[PDB]
Structure formats: structure tokens, C-alpha cells
Amino acid sequence: PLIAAASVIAAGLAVGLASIGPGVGQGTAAGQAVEGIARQPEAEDKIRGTLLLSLAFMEALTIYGLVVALALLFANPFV
Amino acid sequence: PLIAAASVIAAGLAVGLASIGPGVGQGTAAGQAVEGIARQPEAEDKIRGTLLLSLAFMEALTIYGLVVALALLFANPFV
Amino acid sequence: PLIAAASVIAAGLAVGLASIGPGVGQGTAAGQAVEGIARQPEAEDKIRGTLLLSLAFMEALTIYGLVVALALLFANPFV
Amino acid sequence: PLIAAASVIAAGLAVGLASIGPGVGQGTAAGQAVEGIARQPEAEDKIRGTLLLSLAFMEALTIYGLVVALALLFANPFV
Amino acid sequence: PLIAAASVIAAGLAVGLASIGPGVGQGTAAGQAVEGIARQPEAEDKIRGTLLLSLAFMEALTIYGLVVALALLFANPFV
Amino acid sequence: PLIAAASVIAAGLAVGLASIGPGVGQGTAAGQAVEGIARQPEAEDKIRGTLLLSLAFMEALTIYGLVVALALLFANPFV
Amino acid sequence: PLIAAASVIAAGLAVGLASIGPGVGQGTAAGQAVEGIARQPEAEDKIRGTLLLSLAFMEALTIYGLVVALALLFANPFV
Amino acid sequence: PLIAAASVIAAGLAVGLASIGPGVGQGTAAGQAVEGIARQPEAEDKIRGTLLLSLAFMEALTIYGLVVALALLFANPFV
Amino acid sequence: PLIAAASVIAAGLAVGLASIGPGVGQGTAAGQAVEGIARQPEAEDKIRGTLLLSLAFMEALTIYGLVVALALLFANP
Amino acid sequence: PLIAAASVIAAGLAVGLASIGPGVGQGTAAGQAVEGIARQPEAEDKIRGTLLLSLAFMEALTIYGLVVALALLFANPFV
Amino acid sequence: PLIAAASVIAAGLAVGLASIGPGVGQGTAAGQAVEGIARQPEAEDKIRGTLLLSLAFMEALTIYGLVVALALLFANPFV
Amino acid sequence: PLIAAASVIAAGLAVGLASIGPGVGQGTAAGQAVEGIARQPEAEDKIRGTLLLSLAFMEALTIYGLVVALALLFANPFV
Amino acid sequence: PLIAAASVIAAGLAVGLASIGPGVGQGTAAGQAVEGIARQPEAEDKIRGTLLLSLAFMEALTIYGLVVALALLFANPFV
Amino acid sequence: PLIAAASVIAAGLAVGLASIGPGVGQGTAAGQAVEGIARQPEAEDKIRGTLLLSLAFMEALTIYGLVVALALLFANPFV
Ligand code: NA
Ligand code: NA
Ligand code: NA
Ligand code: NA
Ligand code: NA
Ligand code: NA
Ligand code: NA
Ligand code: NA
Ligand code: NA
Ligand code: NA
Ligand code: NA
Ligand code: NA
Ligand code: NA
Ligand code: NA
Ligand SMILES: [Y+3]
Ligand SMILES: [Y+3]
Ligand SMILES: [Y+3]
Ligand SMILES: [Y+3]
Ligand SMILES: [Y+3]
Ligand SMILES: [Y+3]
Ligand SMILES: [Y+3]
Ligand SMILES: [Y+3]
Ligand SMILES: [Y+3]
Ligand SMILES: [Y+3]
């Protein structure tokens, strides 16, 4: 009844809000990672390795909001 | 009844909010990726490769909000 | 009844919010792509190619909010 | 009844919100496109071509909010 | 009844919100267009031409919110 | 009854919101137009001409919110 | 009854919101107009003339919110 | 009854909001007016004259919100 | 009844919001007024005079929100 | 009854909001006042005198919100 | 009854909001106070004295929100 | 009943809000960590070690919002 | 009854909001404190002493929101 | 009943909001701590020690929101 309607919105906002910060975060990090590559091309293969560890780290932040959204939609215990 | 109306809005806000951050994020990253190419054209083929890995990474952030929006509209378990 | 009124607003906000971030994102990227062209005109044909891949990438972000908005208005399963 | 009142507001906010980001986006891009022309007048005919592809790209973002607003007002399936 | 009161507010917010972004956008673009003219007066007649194409482009963004506002007030199909 | 109270607030917010962006926009543009005049006084009569075309352009943005506000207060079709 | 209470708040927010943007706008413009005078005192009588045309332009933005506020309080047609 | 309670809040927000923008605006302008005086003390008597015309201009913005607030509290026509 | 409860909140938000902008405004102006004094100490007595006219000007902005707040609390109505 | 509950919240928000702006304001002013002292230690006793007049000026802004909060809590005329 | 529930939230927001601005304010001031010490270590004992007077000044801003919060919780006259 | 619907939303917002700040935080830190590596490649193995301790530190911030979200969904004491 | 539910949320927002500003504040201060140490390592033991006095000062700001939150949860007089 | 539903949301927002500021704060501090290490690798072991004291200090800010969230969920006195 109500719970079915409630968990369904919490599934929308969980993934809706989660992408706000990291969406911005990965942006500055990647862009600033590129500018450095442009400045020092010889450091490229060395540079991405950090940007990669970095991008994955922030990508996990929106994953938690994605997982809880699905645990709300599919694996919901309360309905 | 109510759930049908609730999941339908959560489908709107999920994809509505998801695009906010990465929309900004990809912007700074790409633009800053271009400026570097302008500075060092010889590094172009080397530069995009990072911008590409970067753009895809952030593009996945709005995908989660797109997928949940569809799982709300079409594949909805609660209706 | 209610669902018809609910899905109709979720169609408005889906496309309303989707344009916020990428609208800003494409702005900085394009403008910064132009400044570099002004600095290095000889790199133009090389520059746009990245800005193009970039602009399309962000243009897809508002497409998801456009598609869900239409799937809400026209192809709505819940009404 | 309600749907007629609901779709009518969703038509207002769809075009209301859509203009926020790109309104800002085109601003920075164009202004930054001009500054470069001032710096390098000889690159003008070369510069606008990118700014044009850019401005149209962002102009499409508010079009989606305009189209859905009209599809809400005029060709509204739900009323 | 309700629809008459609903479409009347959607007419207020449509033109209310539409001016936010482009109001800021045209500002930076024009101001930055002027600074460049001050720097290079000889480029003036060449500069405005881009600022003009630019200003009109963003002016169209608030037009969509103006048109829908009027289509809500005067040409309203739902009342 | 209600419509009279509804159109009356939409008249308040239409002109209330419209001034936000352009109020900021004209500010940066004018101020940046002055700084350039200070830098190059000889370009003054050449400079204002662009600032004038610019200021009017943004002044029209708040006019649309002013006109709709009046069309709501005085020329209201719905009351 | 209600309309009297509604138009009375719309009179408060009309003048409340109108001052936000231009309040900021005139600030940057004037301050930046002064800095230029400090840099080039000899350009003073030439500088203010633009700042004056500019300040008045933005002062008109809050006038529209002031006029509608009064047309709501005193000259109200709906009460 | 209601109107007495409504006009009383509109009196609070009218003067509450009015001070937001100009409060910020006068700040940047004055501070930037001072820095210029520090840079060029000999221009002081010449500088304040612009800052004075400027400060008064923005001070009028909060006056409109003050006047309407009082016209709501004391000279209220609707009560 | 209601009006007594309504005017009482409008008294809270009037002084609550009024301090937002000028609180920021005086901050930049004063701080920027100080930096200039540090740069040119000899201009001090000349500098404050403008900062003073400036600070008072912005201080009046929160006064209007203070006065209306009191006219709501005491002199109500 | 209601008034007792209403004046009690207005006492919370009066002091809650009052500290926002000046809290930021004193911050920039003080910090910028110290950087100058670091740059010119010999000007210290001369510098603080302005920072002191400045800090007190902004401290009075939160005092008005503190006084009204207390006049709401203790000296309340309406209960 | 209601007042007990009302004063209890006003106690939460009073101390909740009070820390926003000064929390930011002390941050810039202190950080900028240390950068100057790094630049001129010999001025340290002279520098902190201003930062101390400054930090206390802003610390008093959150005290007013703390005191009113307690006067709401413990010394509450209205319950 | 209600608690089941309440804890379900608190599970959505807990993980929704938690990612906002650190999402931005890790972004600036990582990106700034990369730029330094580009500047000094020889410091890379030395640099990441700090960025790693840093990234984990901020990653724990969204973990608390993830854990409470799950403790709300799965091991919920109140239902 | 209600008070128990009211004081329980005020306990959540008190500690929820309190961390916003100082969380940002300590960030800039510490980071700026580190950059100075990097610039002048010899000043380290001298530098932290100010950063320590500074960090504690801001840490007290979130303590007030923590204490009131607990005084709401545990030592609550109103239930 | 209601308290069980109320304390459950206050548990969500307490950790939801707590991470906003420090999430940003640790970001700037850490990133700025690494840039300095890149500039002066020899200062590394000296640098982290401050960044560590700093990171922990801000990490405690989200701990208070985590603890109260748990004291709301598990150790709740009011249920
Ligand atoms: Na850089
Ligand atoms: Na760059
Ligand atoms: Na640049
Ligand atoms: Na530039
Ligand atoms: Na420039
Ligand atoms: Na400039
Ligand atoms: Na300047
Ligand atoms: Na300056
Ligand atoms: Na400066
Ligand atoms: Na400075
Ligand atoms: Na500096
Ligand atoms: Na840098
Ligand atoms: Na610096
Ligand atoms: Na730096
Ligand atoms: Y190289
Ligand atoms: Y070249
Ligand atoms: Y040239
Ligand atoms: Y000169
Ligand atoms: Y001179
Ligand atoms: Y000197
Ligand atoms: Y000296
Ligand atoms: Y009692
Ligand atoms: Y090196
Ligand atoms: Y009891």
C-alpha cells in the first residue's frame, strides 16, 4: 500500500542524489588529469593510473545509491 | 492506485537529478581536454584516450538514473 | 485519474531538470574549445573533433530525460 | 479535471527549467568565443563555425523542454 | 475552476524561470564582448556580429518561456 | 474566486523572478564595459554602442515578466 | 476575502525578489567602475556617464517589481 | 482575519528579501572602491563621489522593500 | 489569534533574512579595506573614512529588517 | 496556544539565519586583515583598529537577530 | 502539547543554522592567517593575536544560536 | 505500516545525501593530485600514498550513509 | 506523543546542519596550512600550533549541535 | 507509532547531512596537501602529519552525525 509507494520514491532519489557530487568530482579530476597530460605527454601512462584509481573511487559513491535503489525496487524486504 | 502514481514521479526525478552533476562534470573535463589539445596538438591522439575513459565513466552516472527510471516505468515489480 | 496527473508532471520535470547540468557543461567545454582555436587556428580541424565527441556525449544526458518524458506522455504503460 | 490542471503546470516548469543551464552555458561559450576573436580577428570566420555548432547544440537542450511543454498544452494525450 | 487557477500560475513561472539563466548568460557574453572591443577597437564591427548572433540565440531561450506563458494565458486550450 | 487569487500571485512572481538573472547579467556587462573604457578612453563612443545594444537586450528579458504580470493583473482573460 | 490576502503577499514577494539580482548587479558594475577611475582619474567624467546609464538600466528592473507591488496594494482591480 | 495575518508576513519578507542582493552589491562596490583609494590616495575625493552615487542607487533597492513593508503594516488598504 | 502567531514569525524572518547579504557585503568591503591599508599605511586615515561611510550604508540595510521586526513585535497595529 | 508555538520558532530562525552572512563576512575580513599584517607587520597596531571597527559592525548584525529572538522568548508581548 | 514540540525543533535549527556561516568564516580567516605565518614566521606571535580576536568574534555568532537553543530546551518560559 | 514507509525513505536520502560532498571532495583532491604528478613524475609513487590515505578517508564518509541506509532497509529494529 | 517525535527530528537536524560550515571551514584552513608548510618546512612546528588552535575552534561549532542533539535524545526535559 | 517513524528519518538525515561539508572539506585539504608534496617531495613525511591531524579532525564531524543516527536507530530511548 503506502510502503510500496514510499520505497519506490526512495529508489528514485537515492540514485538521483548520488550522482550530483561525484558527477562534479570526476569532472574536475579528469579534466585536470588531462591538462597535465597535455603539459607532460611523456607522463601519460604514469598519469592515467592515478586518474583511474581516482575515477573508480568516486564511481563507487554513486554505486551505493544505485544498489540501495535496486534493493528498494527489487529485493525490497518491506513489501 | 497510489503506487502507480508514485513510481511514475520517481521515474521522472531519477533521470532528472542524475544529469545535474555529470552534465557539469563532463563539461569541465572535455573543455579542459580541448584547451590542452590546442596547447599541444601533437598530443591529441594521446589526449582523447584519457578524455574518452573519463567521459564514459561519468556517462555511466546518468545511466544508473536512466536504468532505475525505466525499471520504474516498464519493469516495475510493485505494480 | 491520479496517475494520469502524476505521470504528466514527471514528464515536465524529467526534461526540465535534465537540461540544467549539461546546459552548463557544454557551455564551458565549447567556449573553452573556441578560445583554444583562437590561440591555435592551425589546430581547428583537430580541435572540433574532440569538442564534437564531447558535445554529443553531454547531449545524450538530456536525451534520457527527453525519452523518459515522452515515455511518460505517449508510451505510458500505467495509463 | 485534475489532469488538465496538472499537465498545464508541467508545461510551465518544463520550459521554465530547461532554459536555466543552457542560458548560462551559451553565455560563457559565446563570450569566450568573442574574446578570442578580439585576440585573433584573422581567425573570425574560422571561430564562429565552432561557436555556431556549439550554440545550436545547447539550443536543442531548451527545445526538448519547449516541445514537451507544447505536447503537454496542445497535443495532450491524457486530456 | 482549478485549471483556470493552475494555468495562470504556470504562466507566471514559465516566464519567471526562463529569464534566470540567459539573463546571466547574455551578461557575461556581452561584457566579455565589450572588454575585447576595448582591447582591440579595430575589431569592433567584426566583434559585434558574433555577439549579435550570440545575444539573439540566448534571447530565444526566454522567448519559449514567454510564448508558453501567453499560450497559457490567452490561447489556453484547457479552459 | 480562486482564479482571482491565483492570477494575482502569478503576477507577483512573474516580475519577481524575471529580474534575478538580467539584474546580475547587466551588472557584469556594464561594469566590464566601464573597466574597458577606463583602460581605453579613446574607445568610449565606440564601446557604449555595444553595451547599449547589450543592455537593451537583457532589459527585454524582464519586460516579458513585466508584461505577463500586467496581463495577469489588468488584461486578465480568466476573470 | 482570499484575494485580499493573496494579492497582499504577491505585493511582498514582487518587491522582495526584484532587488536580489540588480542589487548584486549594480554592485559589481559600480565597484568595477570605481576601480577604473582609481586607475585612470583623468577618465572620471567620461567613466561615470556609462556607469550612470548602466545603474539606471538596472534600477528599472526593481522598479517593475515595485510598481506591480503597488498596483497590487493600492490600484488592485481584483478587490 | 486572514488578510491581517497575510499582509503581516508579506511585510516581513518584503524587507527580508530586499536586503539580500544590495547587501552583497554595496559590499563589493565599496570594498573595491577602497582598494582603489589605497592604490591612488590622490584620487580619493574624486573616487567617493562615484561610490556615493553608487551606494545611494543600491540603497534605494532596499527602500522599496521597506516602503511596501510599511504600507503593508501601517497604511494597509485591505484591513 | 492567527494574526498574533503570524506577525510573530514575520518578525523572526525579517531580521533573519536581512543580515544575510550585508553580513557578506560588509565582510568583503572591510577586509578589502584592510588589505589596502596594509599596502599603503600612509593612506589609513584617508581609507577608513570611505569604509565608514560604506559600512554604515550597509548597516542600514539590516536596520530596516530590525525596525519592521520590532514594529511587528511591539508596535503591531 | 498557537502563538506560543509560533513565537518560539521565530525565535529559533531569527538567531539561526542572522549568523549566516556575518559569519561569512567577518571571516573574509579578518583573514584578509591578517594576510596584510603578515605582509606588513609594522602596520599591525594600525591594521587591527580598522578590523576591530569592522568586526564590531558585523557583530551587530547577528545581535539584532539575537535580541529579537530573546524578545520573542522572554519579553514576548503576544503571550 | 504543541508548544513543547515547537520549541524543541526551534532548538534544533537555532544551533543547526548558526554554525553555517561562521563555520565557513573562521575557516578562511584561520587558513589565510596561517599562510601569512608561513610567509613571515617572524610575525607569528604578532599574527595570532589578530586571528584570536577574530576567531573569538565569530565564535560568539554560534554562541547566540547555542544559548537560544538551550533557553528553548531548558529555561523555556512557554512550557 | 507508517514506520515501514518512513524508514524506507530515510534509507534513500541517507545514501543520497552522503555522496554529495565527498563526491566533490575526492574530485578536487584527486585531480590536484594528478596535476602534481604531471609536474613532478618522479614524485609519483610518493604522491599516490597521500592521495590514497586521503581518498579512503573521504570514502568512509559515504560509507556511514550507506551503512545506515542498509541498517534501515535490512536490519531495521523498528519493524 | 508528538513531542517525542518532534525532539527526535530536531536531534537529527541539529547535528546534521552543524557539520556543514565547519566541515568546509576546517578544510580550507588545514589545506592552506599544509601548503604553507610545503613552502616553508622550517616553519612546521610553528605552523601547526595556529592550525591546532584554529581546528579546535571550529570543532567546537559542531560540538554545540552535537550536545543539543544529545540533550534532545537523552536528557530531554520535555518528555 | 509516530515516534518510531520520526526517529527513523532523523537517523537518515543526520548521517545524510553530516557528510556534506567535511566531504568537501577533506577534499580541498587533502588535494592541497598533495600539490605541496609534489612541489616539495622532501617535505612529505613532514606534510602528511599535518594532513593526518587535519583529516581526522574533519572525520570526527561526520562521526557525530553517525553516532546520533545509530543512537536513533538502535539505542533509541523514546521507543
Ligand atoms: Na591548473
Ligand atoms: Na587550463
Ligand atoms: Na584558460
Ligand atoms: Na581567458
Ligand atoms: Na580576462
Ligand atoms: Na578583467
Ligand atoms: Na578589475
Ligand atoms: Na581587485
Ligand atoms: Na585584492
Ligand atoms: Na588577497
Ligand atoms: Na592570498
Ligand atoms: Na594549482
Ligand atoms: Na594561496
Ligand atoms: Na595553490
Ligand atoms: Y616535458
Ligand atoms: Y601557432
Ligand atoms: Y594577431
Ligand atoms: Y592615467
Ligand atoms: Y598616483
Ligand atoms: Y607606500
Ligand atoms: Y614593509
Ligand atoms: Y508548564
Ligand atoms: Y622535478
Ligand atoms: Y514525561
Author numbering:
A (entry chain N), B (entry chain M), C (entry chain L), D (entry chain K), E (entry chain J), F (entry chain I), ...: 3 to 81
I (entry chain F): 3 to 79
What's the publication's text?
We isolated the c-ring of the FOF1-ATPase of the green pea (Pisum sativum) from a native preparation, crystallized it, and determined its homo-tetradecameric structure at a resolution of 3.4Å. The crystal structure of the c-ring from P. sativum shows a concave barrel shape with a pronounced waist in the middle, exhibiting tetradecameric symmetry consisting of an inner and an outer ring. Each monomer was a hairpin-shaped, 81-residue polypeptide, containing two trans-membrane (TM) helices; TM1 (residues 4–41) composed the inner ring, and TM2 (residues 46–75) formed the outer ring. The proton-binding site retains a chemical coordination similar to that of the alkalophilic cyanobacterium Spirulina platensis, including the same amino acids: Gln28 and Glu61, located on TM1 and TM2, respectively, of the same monomer, and Phe59 and Tyr66, which are positioned on TM2 of an adjacent monomer. The Oε2 part of the carboxyl group of Glu61 generates hydrogen bonds with the Nε2 of Gln28 and the carbonyl group of Phe59 (with distances between relevant atoms of 3.1Å and 2.8Å, respectively). The second oxygen group, Oε1, forms a hydrogen bond with the hydroxyl group of Tyr66 (2.9Å). This chemical coordination represents a locked conformation of the binding site. Glu61 is likely to be protonated in the structure, which was crystallized at pH 4.5, and this notion is supported by a pKa analysis. One contact region consisted of loop-to-loop interactions mediated by yttrium ions, as indicated by strong electron densities. A galactolipid was tentatively modeled into the intercalating electron density, in compliance with the notion that the uncharged heads of the galactolipids enable their penetration through the thylakoid membrane, as was demonstrated in the crystal structure of cyanobacterial photosystem II.
